[model samples]
Target: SHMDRDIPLKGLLSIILRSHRVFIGRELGHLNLTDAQVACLLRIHREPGIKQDELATFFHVDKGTIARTLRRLEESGFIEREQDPENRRRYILEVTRRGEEIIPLILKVEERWEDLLFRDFTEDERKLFRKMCRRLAEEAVRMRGEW
Candidate 1:
């Protein structure tokens, strides 16, 4: 019933995201990083000097949840928050040693998830999907970024 007619793109997008997280979270069980934690860690790892306030903005999640997740991340030895030397008020986030160590395995898990999801996809279809997803991501940024 939800296949096409009257179904918003965001509806499908929402379910696809949550479904991916279910697989991602289940595989992350042994590593002790919940889906949110893993996402938080990866964001810090990818952009080491990012400030927490900006992190909250980027996640589109409220600041309270970001703070709680970061606190748990700090407690779990995955990350550290350092006061920005110049700003003083802003705290920059970075992955700790443990976080770096776990990244490779976590990435491998992502690859496996993609393999499962795209197992039946032809190479051309996979490439096309990647291209369109990238386009959509860029469009989203351009639409909301400067404003």
Candidate 2:
């Protein structure tokens, strides 16, 4: 029966994302880091001088949430924030040596998870899946802007 079948696309995607986050969170626990902290640390590593507000905007999260995440990361010695000399109100973000040390481990966990997720897929299937996900992500951002 159609009703007895598995969930539709959106529901399945949501469940997968939630479950993956849970898995990632558990893995991060070994490093004493939360998902939010990892995210902030990664972003800071990628963009050495990203502004706090800019990070918040990029993540589509409120400033307070970003601030708290940054605070935790700083306390953990994973990141550092300095007030912009020219713009006193804005804080520049950067990953510290401690954060750099954990990046490889994070990447390892991510690669392991991705490998497990697509282990059975053919190369063509993986390519198509990447294309489809990219399109969906762009559309989601577009729709969010519209709303």
Candidate 3:
């Protein structure tokens, strides 16, 4: 099954990259959100109250990139920054209600996107595949000392 696996993996990755570009373009055209903004929104939704530095590390980008993204999110009324009472040096990122409203839309888009890739799989197969993928991802992080 290795050839079967690798062939589809290569094809799927290519398709995903192209589709993501198209999807982001469509969203930008309609919502005026740059791809970076959508990434910030998704990260905030995943880990609300995450610190700026933490988000920057998570994205593996410069702190300035995250700061700029946060600035845009703040200006768009999608997120707010609050000083961490426990640690004055750090700020907590909180998503606004407007941002919360977009979570379902993002989920819907992601679900449809992934469904396209696994259209041939059964429900159980998809569940198993997800478990394996998560395991592999965790192992990769563990090996990379990023845990």
Top lDDT prediction, candidate number: 1
Write down the worst ten-residue block by lDDT for model 3. Answer: 1-10
How do the residues 1-147 of candidate 1 rate in per-residue lDDT, one tens digit apiece? 337667699988887778778987788876667778888889899999899999999888988899999998898888999899989988899999988999898899888888888988999999999999999999999978778
Tens-digit lDDT string for candidate 3 (103-136): 6876677677688878899999999999998998
True-structure lDDT of candidate 2: 0.86
lDDT by candidate, in order shown: 0.88, 0.86, 0.80
Off by more than 4 A, model 1: 1-5
Choose 2 or 3, whichever is better by lDDT.
2
Model 2 per-residue lDDT tens digits across residues 64-99: 999998998898888889999989999999999988
- Runs in model 2 deviating more than 4 A are 1-8, 141-147
lDDT order of candidates, top first? 1, 2, 3
Candidate 1 Cα deviation (angstroms), residue 58: 1.2
Error of 2 at 36 (Å): 1.8
Candidate 1 residue-wise lDDT at 77: 85
Q: What lDDT does candidate 2 reach at residue 75? A: 87
Provide the clashing-pair count of each candidate structure: 0, 0, 0
Worst-scoring 10-residue span by lDDT in model 2? 1-10
- Per TM-score, the best of the predicted structures is 1
Sort all candidates by TM-score, best to worst.
1, 2, 3
Instruction: Give the TM-score of each candidate.
Output: 0.90, 0.85, 0.75
Better of 1 and 2 by lDDT: 1
